[PDB]
Structure formats: structure tokens, C-alpha cells
Amino acid sequence: NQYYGTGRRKSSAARVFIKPGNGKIVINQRSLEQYFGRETARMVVRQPLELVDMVEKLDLYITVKGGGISGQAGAIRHGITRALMEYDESLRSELRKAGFVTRDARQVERKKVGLRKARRRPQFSKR
Amino acid sequence: RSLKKGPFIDLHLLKKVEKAVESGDKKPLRTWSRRSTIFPNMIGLTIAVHNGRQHVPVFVTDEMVGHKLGEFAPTRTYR
Amino acid sequence: RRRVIGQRKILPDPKFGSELLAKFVNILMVDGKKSTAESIVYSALETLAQRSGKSELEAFEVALENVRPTVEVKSRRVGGSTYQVPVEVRPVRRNALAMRWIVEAARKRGDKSMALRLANELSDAAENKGTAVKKREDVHRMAEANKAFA
Amino acid sequence: AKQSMKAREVKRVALADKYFAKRAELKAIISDVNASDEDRWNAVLKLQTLPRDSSPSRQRNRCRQTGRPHGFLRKFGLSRIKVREAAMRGEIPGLKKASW
Amino acid sequence: ARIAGINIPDHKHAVIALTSIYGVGKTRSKAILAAAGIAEDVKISELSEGQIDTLRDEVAKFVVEGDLRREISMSIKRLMDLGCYRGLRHRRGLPVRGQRTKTNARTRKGPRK
Amino acid sequence: RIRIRLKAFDHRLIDQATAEIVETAKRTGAQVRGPIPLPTRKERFTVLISPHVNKDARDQYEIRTHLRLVDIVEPTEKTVDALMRLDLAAGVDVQISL
RNA sequence: CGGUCCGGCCGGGAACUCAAAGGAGACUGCCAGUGAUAAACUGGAGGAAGGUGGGGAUGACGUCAAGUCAUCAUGGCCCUUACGACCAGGGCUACACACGUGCUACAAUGGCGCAUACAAAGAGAAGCGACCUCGCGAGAGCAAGCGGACCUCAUAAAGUGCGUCGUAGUCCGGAUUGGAGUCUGCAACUCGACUCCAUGAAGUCGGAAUCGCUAGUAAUCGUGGAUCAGAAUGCCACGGUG
RNA sequence: GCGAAGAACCUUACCUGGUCUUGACAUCCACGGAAGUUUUCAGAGAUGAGAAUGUGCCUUCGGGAACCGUGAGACAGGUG
Secondary structure, three states: OOEEEEEEEOOEEEEEEEEEOOOEEEEOOEEHHHOOOOOOOOOOOOOOHHHHOOOOOEEEEEEEEEOOHHHHHHHHHHHHHHHHOOOOOOHHHHHHHOOOOOOOOOOOOOOOOOOOOOOOOOOOOOO | OOOOOOOOOOHHHHHHHOOOOOOOOOOOEEEEOOOOEOOOOOOOOEEEEEOOOOEEEEEOOOOOOOOEHHHOOOOOOOO | OOOOOOOOOOOOOOOOOOOOHHHHHHOOOOOOOHHHHHHHOOOOHHHHHOOOOOOOOOOOHHHOOOOOOOEEOOEEEEOOEEEEOOEEOOHHHHOOOOOOOHHHHHHHOOOOOHHHHHHHHHHHHOOOOOOOOHHHHHHHOOOOOOOOOO | OOOOHHHHHHHHHHHHHHHOHHHOOHHHOOOOOOOOOOOOOOOOHHHHHOOOOOOOOOOOOOOOOOOOOOOEEOOOOEEHHHHHHHHHOOOOOOEEEOOO | OOOOOOOOOOOOEOOOOEOOOOOEOHHHHHHHHHHHOOOOOOEOOOOOOOOOHHHHHHHOOOOOHHHOOOOOOOOOHHHHOOOOHHHHHHHOOOOOOOOOOOOOOOOOOOOOO | OOEEEEEEOOHHHHHHHHHHHHHHHHHHOOOOOOOEOOOOOEEEEEEEOOOOOOOOOEEEEEEEOEEEOEOOOOOOHHHOOOHHHOOOOOOEEEEEEO
16 A cells, blocks of 8 residues: 655655555655754645644655755645545545645746846836 | 066067177167066166157166066056 | 735744744844844743743743834825824734844844844843834834824 | 958968967977976977967958858857848748747 | 064964064964964963974975065165156056056045045 | 767657667667667747847747667677668758767 | 665666657636626635736837947948058057946854755867866866766855854955966967965945835845857856745 | 957057058959979068979860969949
8 A cells, every 4th residue: 555646846846655654754765854954944844744643653755856955845745745635535625725735836937038037127227 | 477488589689689788888779669578688778669659768677577668668648 | 005915824833823923033034044044043032031031931022012112103194285193003013013123233233142132132122121223213203293283 | 341351261271270270289398398398399389480470360250141250150150130030031941930 | 482483472372473574374374283283273372392393394484574574675766766657656546456547546546625 | 989860850750760770770689778869959049139239129039859869789880780771751860970 | 676785786667857749627617796687807616726827929100309321232422552451569448527337344144264965057079177186276287088868067055064263443354565376379568367475554334326126026145158369247048045 | 247249469440650552352354473382681560582492283286274473444442
């Protein structure tokens, strides 16, 4: 038995895998506290994961590639909810109320003239 | 230093410098160029270089050799 | 005419159940460097208790509920004329402004570490003795003028 | 652009092939003077100043079609504004407007 | 004392004790501290024999102090008596470092009213 | 030491040239390693449309073409002997170096 | 799925990613209420997401006494022992004087030297130049790999560790003035680019005159390349944090 | 930080001091020479003179093509 989910966020992509066993969390061949640096709140990977009881009976395995290290945490949250929506056929409805099934449509900008990347339209003249 | 290989003068000027001393007490030789480097092989005398309008007299110094004649001759007017 | 898109939601703090206590990591932030902005958050409350701080698990509430503004300035138009009035502060901003005055008191003023300066201002807020900053004196110096309207 | 630029440039490329192009690896010993080897190359180095018109290049290469020394793309050999004019006429294969 | 020749400083900092004298600057001090294998902090009190006088050929390798200090008295006529661009640009507010003269001369050209 | 290039203008033409080249490879000897594609690329060139200066007004043209490198795992020129006698459509270019 | 002291290291494979190609999905369509039971608007449902779904392509008569004959053609037009243009040198980085735009320091969330972490997009066989070295260092050696997802430039910085020093006009700051190296060339006086060691008045986030910004926005820190013997802090391109 | 995706030589304007005048570039016609290579003397240098050496290509045995220095009548030329 395996539960599985995938997520894309800010030019990163994640794969999340859940099995029965003794409780642990593994990410990119290390433990969770040894990734993401010192963190501000460390909560977006935990947000949906409390709903099936935190580190009680599930064996959690993660692999994530690309983007900034903040974007990798966002890709993992969607990978967790894509796996949880097949752990019980009613769980998707409570994750919807919390907003953990939603995805952004805010990808990287093109040109479009005159812009430095996405803003700063020319020089605003002189006095 | 400008330059590490070593500066040179062209044969038509070398032919004049090797016949400039002599006594070194004559009227300044018109060497024209402001690019010439006063490097230690050069002999101590007074010479004349072009400012764009006329020629200006300058001396080949012994207290310093790390210079070109454009550092001593003024070539621009009114500034 | 106040036309803007709907206000920006945020989630309550995962340890303290409040959207205002989640705000401290944005205070004394520069260069977008939130990493170092959190490095004085909750880590100065013991330095504060080892001065004059009391109730160390809630000694941060002094900048939220023990020092509170209520008067704002200046002008109201009435037809062709302008007159001075004391105005009311919006209730959420009114609880979240005394925690924001601290920038001059920590970067333009203050001795040794930014953490000691944070503890220095939270000591004074427990007795409301906080030395006034330009972002408060730009209101408080003028708030007692024209007590008769038009 | 002048019509003299069509001959003058390639005469100055033939000058480079006569005096510098097949001597470019040897520049690390003939123009080296002292850093390596020995004092034996100063009479050989007189070749580096035998011509007197163009030294390391003395010119810039031009677009054949327009005669211009800048504003041209070496992936076409052509001036970048003329690449859009020929693309609007449909004359450059595989090249078309974005959309978009 | 005497850590790099005949030096007269005593109980100054480990890195900055021979500064502003043509003596030994910060990077050269940091280099000799690591070569002698000695503490790079606070004011010196603990110093042994065989540590640093045996390494003088790093810190005082050719020229120091009086070899370069106060050396203008015989290098001034080539600037103030010989006609030269740098001499006029010692007696007038005109720069030499390739910077502008049309813009922000202030004050560097003197007052102004 | 043996280098191969295949270039086309269309995603069907790059495969229908790969198909004949990999059939030539299989016919020359079984190997089961799989031919190298490597990523197809495109390029785009921005131009200013005003006859003098003004960079606040643009136009954009793009050119799309397909490239494959194949790779032979054997050091022996008998592996490419019939590949160097192969005829293809005009819409494709092949370049082989030994 | 297998070899396996337990790393794509290797048989060998095709899920994610990347690079390519096709087809689905969102239509006010469904429900209510409002509206003129029309067009349309707002909630609710489902959904990755709704409400010209978002962003791109882009524009009429006239206007601004617009802007360009040097991107192209061309009227009239100036010049002919010459305004043709070949040659050596100078100049386009002048400054009696006015005003924008970019940036650093004042530290303390820091400076500097070491330790450690993540790219994206490009470009390079008389080149890019590894590892390992020489050196205070730019850079050059001993010299490999590589015709570019394969080798190389290359190291993402902010961050997080470790040492030192700390409201001191300061170990910083820099005006003012010099030396000794490294790179390209025939040759850098004049109008080129790095590095190391010194010189040492002022410097407390600021005069007149004043800007951009409503959210991945203000802000802040990264990386390539064109032009090319040969310079980027400008310009086009490509990302973290907020 | 605008054309300029880049001026120590160039480019190139503008300016100085030299030099040439059917032209650096193109063409219609002859004269003496293949195009060239090697190299010295004077002059800042372009050039102006020296010391030597070629004859190939194409082709009706004639004569051409090409190109260097010369010169008229036509006519070029200009980042004006």
C-alpha cells in the first residue's frame, strides 16, 4: 500500500509518498529539521499534515527539485494533499475548507515593453 | 612602467640624438613628439616638442625617468 | 475615494492563535531580510524580564494593550474652507501602531545590540515612559489644537 | 558606406595573413622578450613592425549588403532591421513573427 | 616591544600597533601573527622567545619606517620648480584622476559666493 | 571520435529521419542502448520599428528548428559505412565527422 | 526491476523534471436573487481557476508649429587643385557657471577573512581553461577535459556557522599625494582594465530642490552575452528573499 | 549611460601641418610593364628614389584576361 501526490510551485516540483509503518519524515535523503535553513514559521509543510495526526502512524517520504527553498515547501503541501485525498474519500472536503487544494496561476513574466523584468516603466522624466 | 618590454625611438630620431652631444650647449633640437619616454638610456639635454601651434622647450631629467614629454609640455589652450 | 481591492487575509500564529502576534517578524525588517528580522523575535523577552519585565509569557502585550494611541490629526474640508479636527483611529490599526513606532528608537537611537534596544523599549512600555519618536511627535504635538472646530 | 571599403578591408585581411595570422602562436615567444626562453628573438620581432598601415586589426568587419560595421547579426551576415524587412516579405526560411 | 626590529610600542593591540608610521599595516600584522603561531586578539602581554624575531624576514623584508617616511624635501622641485601638469594641478583645484571638471567642482575649485 | 548531426524544420521530419538512421544502426548491428536526442532549441530577435531611436516600441520574430546528435558507441568505421551512403528528404541535413 | 558496504557508481528502465508534440478543461454554463423574466451583475455549488477566466499581438478623422533625408530612394541644394581623401598628429572624457540619474560610509539586523547551501539563462578547439600550484594578488604556470544536459567559465549572493572589533570622528570612512605588480597592443602622454603596499583633512543616514509605490508591489542581492587586439558600473537576457 | 552593439592607431565628422588632382572608387582608349616578391636611402609619413628578380593564365600561329605606373575627351567623388 502507497499513497502518492505531485505539486508544482515557483519553478520547483515535488513528489510525496506515504506508507504504513513506524512514524518518520524524510526529505531529499535527510530529516525535516536539517532542510529549509533556520525558518520563519516552518508551518506550510505541517498545515494539512496535522489532520491525519502528526507523526503518529504514517511513514512519509519526499523528493523535491528546482526553485528557491521556500517554493519547495509550497510544492510539498500540494503533494501531501494529493496523497491525503486518496487516504480517505471524504478528506478532500475539509482540506478545501482550509484552502490546501487551491493552486496559483502566477508564472514568470515575458517582455512586454518597457519593463526591467515586470515593473519600472521607463524613467518618469525630469523636473 | 607603461609598457614592460622597454620603450624605443625611431631610427630618424636615434640618428639625431647620437649626434646631439657634442657640447649640449646649442639651441634646443626640435624632436616634435610628446610620446617619447625619458627612460634611463636617454641622454641629459634640452629638446623642443610640438604643442599643436608652435614648439616648447623641455629638459631630459635625472631625478625621474618614469615619464613621457606630454607630462611636462602643455598642449591645450585656453584650458 | 478609498477605492482599492479587498483587504489581504493572513492566518493566525501557529503557537499563539492570533493574526497580530504573527506580525512581529515584519517589524524592524530591512532589505526583505526576514531571516535576520526574526532573530530578535521572542529572544529579547528574557533580557526584558532581567531588567523590569513581568509575566514573561505575555510581557510582549505591553506594546499592544498597555501602550495604545487614540488621537490622529489634522484637517477636514467644509465647503470652500479647511478646519482642524481630532480624528478617530481604525480599531485594528489602533492596536498595531505602538509596536511600529520602535524604528527610530532602535536604529536612529539606542545602545549595543538591536535585541537590547528592543528590551529597552519594552521595559519602558510596561510603565508607559517610552521616549517619543518623530512618527509619534508628527501627530501628538498637534492633536491638542483647535478645540472649537468652525 | 564607400565602395572602397569592399577592397580596402580584404587587402587589410591579406596584410594580416601575410604578417600576423600564421605567426599568432609564435607571439608567445617572439613578442615575449624576457619572461621565458633567452635573448635571441629581437631581430625576428622586427617583422611585427615591418608593415606600417594596420597592426592588431586597424578595422572592423562589415555587412556585405548594407556596408555597415555595426547593427548586423553574424547568424545571417545581415543588418538586424533588414532581417525584419526580409521577414515581413517572407524571404528568410523558418523566420516568422511571434504572436504574442 | 621590538616584535619587528627596534620597535617602541608596548601593550597595544595584536593587529594595530605599527599603523600610520610606514611600519606594519593590518594585513601584514595578520600574516605574521599566523606565521609565528600566536594569538590574534586583545593587547599583547604573553609573548615568548623564538616566536617572531626569528621571522623578521616576513614583516621587515626590505623597507620600513624611516626608509619611506618624510621623503618630500628632495622630490618637490620636480613638481614646484620644473614646469609640469601635476605641479599646476597641485597649485589649482583641477583634478588628475580622469573625473569631471564641468560638473560638481564645488569647493574643490574653492568658493563660490 | 565519430560525431553525427541531424537537423530538421518539423517534429515529424526529425522522427522520420531518426527512424531511417536507427533502422540503419539496427541493420548494421544490435546494441539496445537507444539513440541520443538532446533538447531542441529556438531563437528570437527583437527589432526597433522607429526609423531613429525610440526603444519603447518593439517587434518580435522567432525561428524554430529541431536538432539530434544520435551517438555511436563503437570505435569502428564499419558501423557508419552504409550510414555515409544514405539518401533522405531535402527538408533534413546530416553532418558526419570521423 | 536488479548488481551492490548499503552514491545513478553499474546492468538497465521510463514515473517526476527538462526539451519536444497532440488532446481534454471554464461555457454565465448550472441555481437563486436583482434587472426591463433582455443584455447584464453579485453570491452559492463544483473546480486548478471562474465572471471580457489571466497576460500577450495590438490603435481611426484630426492633434502635439511631433520625430527621421546619416536605415532606404529622392526634388532643390552646397563643394571641384575641393567640403574629394590620402598621410602624420590632434580633438569628441575642455570648464570663470547651473541642474538631473547611479552609488558608498555613518555600522551593530554590521565590516572583513575562513566554513557551508540553492539556481536560471548563455557562451568557448589558434578558444573556455579543470584539478594541482606559484604569489600579498591581478594573473600566469604544470597542463587534463571539451565541438557543449556530456568538459569549461562556475563561485548563486542575501542567508547560516566561526573568529575579531565595536557610539569609538572607530580596526571603518575617504578628500589629499605616491610607489610596486598583473593584462591587451607597434604603441595606452592623450580618451584602456584589474592587484598589492602606503599617504590620511572631513565623515553621527544629510542644503536648496525633491521622487516612485496598493502586493510578489515598494525593497534588496544575484548570473550571462553582444560590440571586440582591447573596458563595462550602461543595454538586452535570466533568478533568490520580501 | 540618447543614435553609439564601444574613438590610444583607426573610425571621423571637426581642427592642424603635409601631399595629389580624371581621382582612394567605376567605366570607354593607348603607352611601358604580368599581378607580384625581396629590400635600402631620404622624409613625420603618404611618397620620392635605389639594388635585384619575374613572363605565368587563356588562346585562330594573331590576340586576349588581369593589373602596376602613365595621360586626354567623356566622367567619377563627398559620415556635404
